[PDB]
Amino acid sequence: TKQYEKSENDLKALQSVGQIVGEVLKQLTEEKFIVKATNGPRYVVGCRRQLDKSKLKPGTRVALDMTTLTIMRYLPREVDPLVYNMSHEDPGNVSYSEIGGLSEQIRELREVIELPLTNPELFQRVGIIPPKGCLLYGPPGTGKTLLARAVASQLDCNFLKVVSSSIVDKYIGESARLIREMFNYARDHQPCIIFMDEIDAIGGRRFSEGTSADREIQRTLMELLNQMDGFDTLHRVKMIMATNRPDTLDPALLRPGRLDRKIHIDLPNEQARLDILKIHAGPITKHGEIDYEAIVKLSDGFNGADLRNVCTEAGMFAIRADHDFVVQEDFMKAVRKVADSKKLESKLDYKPV
Amino acid sequence: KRFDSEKAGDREVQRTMLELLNQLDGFQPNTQVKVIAATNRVDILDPALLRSGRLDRKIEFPMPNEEARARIMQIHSRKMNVSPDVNYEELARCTDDFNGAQCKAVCVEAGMIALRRGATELTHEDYMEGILEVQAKKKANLQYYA
Amino acid sequence: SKMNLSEEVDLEDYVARPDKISGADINSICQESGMLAVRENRYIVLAKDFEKAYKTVIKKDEQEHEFYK
Ligand SMILES: Nc1ncnc2c1ncn2[C@@H]1O[C@H](COP(=O)(O)OP(=O)(O)OP(=O)(O)O)[C@@H](O)[C@H]1O
């Protein structure tokens, strides 16, 4: 029962008041150390006898006391968006080769990513600069989020994710230090891979500057433009971006450097649609008599999200008939009808609104 | 999303709606708690909305049928006390292209006919009254012209 | 001058046919020609890999002699 006495004595040590944290700036002398608290005041204070030479550091966060503001222990500094960035997930592996097309985009994205990791020798011996970035835009077909994130999730602890909602951040919020942090940790984990999706809102041009909120978009831009075209070495880390249209990217992003390789997604083709139907027919049960050319021919110019989810819509029409294994006749009904209904809903392609 | 930028006043939400498409893309738990959406017009529609997680069933509701406009307005008028001898034949055919809200405009109008009102509705002309109120009535026709 | 030569790639044609489609083809667009050299898969980048980046662009037309026309 002495564990209670042990537990309460540990809570007696909890009577010790907590301290405050700050960032070291410089040092005037041994008895005065410039430290900037997270609030922004800067103090020059002494120190106690329990610390070492590793406490000083070149501008690293420290914990200031609440009385004399002296430093107790030092800890590594992070603003910690990254743990939130690593909270993503995705199956595959397999989903790499499941899309089926285009075969040239399947093989190339495997090279520019994996080859610099395993074989740097080809770059240094031939004397060529490997691509440090890439651009995958849409939606002329699917595979943007599927193929890129598959290698991401398979690369495990080495990856960086960016959602377009985190750039605006909060009122009078600072995303300029996020752009510098995103590329700072990109230079830590190697090779790092960064995904930026739906940049049309956060890629704001400075031609027409609305209200007070367009400039803070330009600030996040110029922070991206500086480090991607640096002057700061990104050669080992790979970057990826995504957008609906490259209208607002400006000559800065449309240029090479910051955006290196722009690979346009291609819609599924009758030859390639035969492969994507094989992977769709796996999870769904079918009748013993099935023809893959029937579904491929009846559905043309449809994205992979259209084909899959309508093939599940065919299963929802199949459960309307309660049959477990269903012939493709009931499928071709639900596949053609529901898909042709989707075509009269959204205008594009080809006509803009 | 319009065409050019910047900027739209709701652009913060038009990015969040596309973030919802990202939540329906990369986040598997978003397959739970189905969300229902409704719009007034499809004039502006995002092509990226196609998915099971994203907009899947999209229904075009046209102007209700003449028999449909009579059924929806009868369910609304079942509570009120109406004068007898309602054939339902003329009121259904007199309803053409009219929206369901304009049908309740006649239903809400049909609830005022009890007391006086004081204008004399009598009977069987009640439905065709507020039916013409929005798009009719001449007047002209001819005058000042041929 | 930076690439090892060991040429294996024609330095003649690049001053003729791509020179007509040059401009632009500005600056780091030539780095993409070097960034398209990772397509190989070969001991030395093929002559078509540099030209593939120079032909696309994804620009013009057509144009010049057709404008005269
Ligand atoms: N060929 C496919 N096979 C399996 N699933 C697919 C396929 N294409 C799309 N999907 C599903 O659709 C979702 C979105 O994929 P992706 O980002 O590649 O297309 P998208 O950009 O959403 O297309 P759109 O913009 O036309 O909706 C993914 O979560 C994926 O599960």
How far from the centroid of its chain's Cα atoms is residue A35's Cα? 34
For residue C6, give the amino acid letter: S
How far from the centroid of its chain's Cα atoms is residue C64's Cα? 19
Q: How many CB atoms lie within 10 A of CB C39?
A: 18
Neighbouring residues of A199: CB distance < 8 A, sequence distance ≥ 6: A164, A241, A242, A243, A248, A249
Q: Is B134 in the pocket of ligand 1 (CB under 6 A)?
A: no
Tokens 């070291």 correspond to A24
Q: Which residues of B touch A306 (CB under 8 A)?
A: 50
- How far apart are the C-alpha atoms of A303 and A294, rounded to whole Å? 17
CA torsion sign for A102, A103, A109, A112 is: negative
Q: Is A139 in the pocket of ligand 1 (CB under 6 A)?
A: yes
- How far apart are the C-alpha atoms of A13 and A220, rounded to whole Å? 45
Q: How many CB atoms lie within 10 A of CB A139?
A: 18
Tokens 């909060």 correspond to A170
C/B touch flag: 3 or more CB pairs below 8 Å: no
Residue A143 contacts B where some CB pair is shorter than 8 Å: no
Ligand 1 pocket: which of A145, A309, A311 to mutate (most atoms <8 Å of CB)? A145
Nearest alpha-carbon partner for A239 in A314, A158, A133, A325: A133
How far from the centroid of its chain's Cα atoms is residue C20's Cα? 11
Three-state DSSP at C15 gives: helix
- How far apart are the C-alpha atoms of A302 and B55, rounded to whole Å? 15
CA distances from A277 to A253, A291, A307, A308 (A): 36, 10, 8, 8
Helix axes C47-55, C28-35, angle to 10 degrees: 140
Q: Considering CB atoms only, which of A115, A126, A131 is closest to C4?
A: A126
Q: Would you call A77 exposed, middle or buried from its count of C-beta atoms within 10 A (0-12, 13-18, 19+)?
A: middle
The answer to whether the beta carbons of residues A247 and A202 sit under 8 Å apart is: no
Q: Is A149 in the pocket of ligand 1 (CB under 6 A)?
A: no
A208 and B4 within 8 Å at the Cβ level: the answer is yes
According to DSSP, residue A187 is labeled T
- How far apart are the C-alpha atoms of A131 and A116, rounded to whole Å? 9
Residue C25 contacts A where some CB pair is shorter than 8 Å: no
According to DSSP, residue C36 is labeled G
Nearest alpha-carbon partner for C37 in C57, C20, C52: C52
- A260 CA to chain C: closest CA distance, Å? 7
Q: Which residues of A touch C32 (CB under 8 A)?
A: 256, 260-261
Name the structure determination technique: cryo-EM
Enter the resolution in angstroms.
8.0
For chain B, counts of helices (H) and of strands (E): 5, 0
Residue C1 contacts A where some CB pair is shorter than 8 Å: no
- Atom 7, ligand 1: residue with shortest CA distance: A304
Nearest alpha-carbon partner for A191 in A136, A242, A152, A241: A152
Q: For the CA atoms of chain C, what is the radius of gyration?
A: 13
The answer to whether the beta carbons of residues A273 and A109 sit under 8 Å apart is: no
Beta bridge partners of A62: A22, A74
- How far apart are the C-alpha atoms of A284 and A308, rounded to whole Å? 10
Interior angle at CA B16, CA A196 and CA A201, nearest 5: 55
